[PDB]
Structure 1
């Protein structure tokens, strides 16, 4: 996969994963790694971040890889092609990636039928501690962003353990302004009303996924709206449009969202701030630059109940999943935690 262009390599990775051609992971999850949050049991706290399986093609292969939960998407209401290629760039010297896909999506109807073909299989997986998240986006030309998200709630909500209102892609014009207070309250009120209108066994948790580039005011406002409306959780963070000092990759000045190691601590600090602003009462899924057990535990101690990764998988391969989990269990023991749950937010209680 490293030898092809990055997008072609990704498509080959998705196809290979979907076929199950990867040997089943050998790491057996210990009880120490179980987390109960968002109304569900998670066998382990390490998920695949949105973007790897944009269209829901490889869910079962990803569980076989050892992920404790899978998030697909972002999915847009209508199919759309995204930006012209190339739109994904490797920064090997930084263990980073820059992408500007622009919400390439098979669309709600195609993804709906894909998930329906395995809906009862997923119900059993969820009951066994392996939940499914669905990340919702908006079409490029849509005139009414809230209605795009409402359509996603109605169509894929009934197939999801949790939904993500992705208002933080750097690659759709105007999207991140949906993170402002008034716009976000109106958008999330509509999303939650649509969610509440689904039948009980088809009613997912709703989370908001936020950028790492927010001002202090932006974060205060998001925290306020999340508590006012009863939003079920936050995903922290998407990719960054910043370019931290010190990037070495030749492609560092490509337009797009930066992921991987240069994002890691910006993400951890955003988790830390959002946990404090919500008094530790709002579950956080922490994501950005996780490639080791230490990376995972730092985000958990900062306030994350669960973590996700994507970019590290494309540098270290499938073994990184078991590596993170084994290192995490060892660090929890070394630091005197009974399990993941005991470590959530621990830095704030020092």
Structure 2
């Protein structure tokens, strides 16, 4: 049973490594091991119940790795090996940039949470382009086999024209991606989340979509917008409106939160940055629920924020997500968490009378 690796990781290896390594070192080591395929056995075999068709693609299972883990596209193949149904790399900025000073990442173990203020540390588009080009046909085969690749695009700290930074990303990495994400929801770049005062969001996304439409057909990715959990009701209404009007392909709901929910215990709760993990979970699920309603269920949503179990995944799917991602849970529980979530989700689907993931998408809105 896989529960062996799961328990060993969760109860012994992971807490040991947490005591030995600072969180940024732990991130770097996890990326390096993953990149080399040095992974526990992923004992879980994906069943047909977990397959999802969305965004022009087959997804063998609906559990992805969220942006921010493999920022620079170094570990994509090991992430599939780990059992993820899809991988999102980035955020990638046009020019290389260092990000914020260290320390810039903090664990809140008591809360099963993380706070980060990386500030879009990125190798930049050219480096990532060449890295993805080196495995482009391997990725075409993976995609055809139900294992798509997403690329999350960011902007540089000193850029004078945000829309131009995103357009550069679409031109350079769009041809190498199944989907692109216009991340206008980092907490850690000044001005970024403001990329929604309405006619200006419309202006940005129109430029992005024009650049995407200009790519040759087999190199033309889906375009998604990733939003924060901190938006006003007005901002959410506005985003829904623009997405419908422009024919944006989907939404990623959500990025980290700049809020600090009552009840956090970790000593580092008042560090600046975005909060992820358990305390974000229900805020994210509620944002999914509202965006699904505002878009009439016609816009695919990738649900993200605090997923650590099959129940967490199913709640997001029933709220409206077609796919989910996780990050922070991997940091606490290690690679076995991926099989755990998938096994649990399959069991819950059966118990609740769903034929598969597809049948559960948005199920709460139909009761």
The residue correspondences of 1:1-350 to structure 2 (distance < 5 A) are 2-350=19-367
CA deviations 1:224-282 (Å, max 9, x no partner) are 00000000000000000000000000000000000000000000000000000000000
Q: Which runs of 5+ in 2 are unaligned?
A: 1-17
Q: Matched residues in 1 for 2:43 and 2:110: separation? A: 30
Are 2:40 and 2:335, in contact at CA under 8 Å, matched by a contact in 1?
no
Aligned residues of 2:178 and 2:222 also touching (Cα < 8 A): yes
CA deviation map 1:128-152 (0-9, x unaligned):
0000000000000000000000000
CA contact (8 A) 2:40 2:336 kept: no
Q: CA deviation at 1:8?
A: 0.6
Does the CA-based 8 Å contact 1:46-1:306 persist in structure 2?
yes
Matched position secondary structure for 2:268: coil
Quick one: distance in 1 between partners of 2:173 and 2:26?
Answer: 28
Could you report, residue by residue, the CA deviation over 1:47-92 in whole angstroms, capped at 9, with x for unpaired residues?
A: 0000000000000000000000000000000000000000000000
* Counterpart-to-counterpart distance in 2, 1:139 and 1:24: 38
Question: Shift in Å at residue 23 of structure 1?
Answer: 3.6
Q: Give 3-state SS (helix, strand or coil) of 1:9's partner.
A: helix
TM-superposed deviation, 1:121: 0.1
Which whole-Å CA distance do the structure 2 matches of 1:290 and 1:5 have between them?
A: 23
Does the CA-based 8 Å contact 1:2-1:9 persist in structure 2? Answer: no
Q: How many residues are paired up?
A: 350
CA distance in 2, matches of 1:75, 1:2: 30
Q: For the Cα contact (< 8 Å) 1:87–1:99, is it kept in 2?
A: yes
- The alignment's C-alpha RMSD in Å is 0.6
Which deviates further from its counterpart, 87-96 or 2-11? 2-11
Q: Which runs of 5+ in 1 are unaligned?
A: none
CA distance in 2, matches of 1:23, 1:292: 19
1:165-190 CA-to-partner distances (Å, cap 9, x unmatched) read 00000000000000221211000000
CA contact (8 A) 1:168 1:179 kept: no
How far apart in 2 are the matches of 1:24 and 1:206? 34
Instruction: Give 3-state SS (helix, strand or coil) of 2:43's partner.
Output: coil
Distance 2:105 2:197 in 1: 28
> Aligned partners of 1:235, 1:83: CA distance in 2, in Å?
25
1:188-209 superposed Cα distances (whole Å, 9 cap, x missing partner): 0000000000000000000000
Q: Shift of residue 24 of structure 1?
A: 4.0
Q: Distance in 2 between matches of 1:38 and 1:321?
A: 22
Query: Structure 2 CA distance, aligned partners of 1:174 and 1:345?
Result: 33
For 2:217 and 2:78, how far apart are their aligned partners in 1?
Answer: 28
Post-superposition Cα deviations, 1:201-224, rounded to whole Å, max 9, x if no partner, equal 000000000000000000000000
Q: 2:364 & 2:197 partners in 1: Cα distance?
A: 28
Secondary structure, aligned partner of 1:179: coil
Name which of structure 1's ranges 337-346 and 174-183 shifts more when overlaid on structure 2. Answer: 174-183
Corresponding residue SS for 1:2: helix
Q: Tell me if structure 2 keeps the 8 A contact 1:180–1:222.
A: no
Could you list the per-position Cα deviations for residues 9-52 of structure 1 after superposition, in whole angstroms to 9, with x for gaps in the alignment?
10011001000111441200000000000000000000000000
Instruction: Give the conservation status (yes or no) of the 8 Å contact 1:75–1:105.
Output: yes
After superposing on structure 2, the runs of 4+ consecutive aligned residues of structure 1 that deviate more than 4 Å are none
TM-score by length of 1: 0.99
Q: Could you tell me how far apart the structure 2 residues matched to 1:246 and 1:238 are? A: 20
